[PDB]
Amino acid sequence: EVETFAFQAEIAQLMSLIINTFYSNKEIFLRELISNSSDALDKIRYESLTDPSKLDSGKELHINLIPNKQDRTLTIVDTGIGMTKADLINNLGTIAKSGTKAFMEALQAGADISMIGQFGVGFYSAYLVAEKVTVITKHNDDEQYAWESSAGGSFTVRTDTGEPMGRGTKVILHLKEDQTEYLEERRIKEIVKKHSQFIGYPITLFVEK
Numbered sequence: 243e244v245e246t247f248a249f250q251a252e253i254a255q256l257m258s259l260i261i262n263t264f265y266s267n268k269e270i271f272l273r274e275l276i277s278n279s280s281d282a283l284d285k286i287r288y289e290s291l292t293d294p295s296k297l298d299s300g301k302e303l304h305i306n307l308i309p310n311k312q313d314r315t316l317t318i319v320d321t322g323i324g325m326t327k328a329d330l331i332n333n334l335g336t337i338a339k340s341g342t343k344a345f346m347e348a349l350q351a352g353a354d355i356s357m358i359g360q361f362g363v364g365f366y367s368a369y370l371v372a373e374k375v376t377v378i379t380k381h382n383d384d385e386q387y388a389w390e391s392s393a394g395g396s397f398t399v400r401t402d403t404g405e406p407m408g409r410g411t412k413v414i415l416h417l418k419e420d421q422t423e424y425l426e427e428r429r430i431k432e433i434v435k436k437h438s439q440f441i442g443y444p445i446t447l448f449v450e451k
């Protein structure tokens with residue numbers, strides 16, 4: 243059972259701007275997703291400070307980067323707080339409508355796409371490099387769900403029958419044909435060192451056979 247939803251008009255317009263604007267500095271997508279993972283890990287850590295059972299779904303707080311050249315996917319896994327079904331539908335837990343408004347005033351005033359994370363909609367920078375994004379997520383208070391969108395104005399949500407996750411979020415980037423540099427070990431290492439040196443969780447770059 244798959245539910246199909248329309249993006250709010252303002253979010254559809256943000257996505258088309260990210261997809262259509264000429265902008266060479268695409269590597270910031272990884273910084274933005276790692277920062278989102280760090281924020282989610284901070285949230286479950288804070289909740290666990292007064293309720294240790296919040297970590298019964300997994301004590302380890304980490305971020306994994308998993309490239310797969312055969313599937314042409316880059317997967318970013320964290321064991322943060324995750325999102326409920328309602329969170330997924332409501333723009334993956336963001337205030338994306340007001341964030342898009344502020345972001346787009348900034349660009350018309352001199353900002354560039356790399357400051358997208360200052361407006362709370364950094365997730366959508368994934369479409370700088372991905373033709374399709376799948377988000378698998380599990381929050382302590384809900385079941386495991388899969389969100390998916392190839393932009394074009396709609397997203398789907400379904401119960402996930404795949405490998406159970408325990409708790410956290412997995413962002414699967416189905417990369418564009420000309421963006422496969424983000425599957426190469428040395429390129430990912432360079433980006434992580436450049437933009438994510440002060441993330442307070444272990445970031446593990448998986449290698450391939």
Ligand SMILES: Cc1cc(C(N)=O)c(C(F)(F)F)o1
Pocket residue numbers: 275278279282320322324325334335336365377410411412413
């Ligand atoms: C906005 C937001 C939060 C998270 C998360 N829970 O880690 C994500 C992700 F994963 F889709 F990129 O986006």
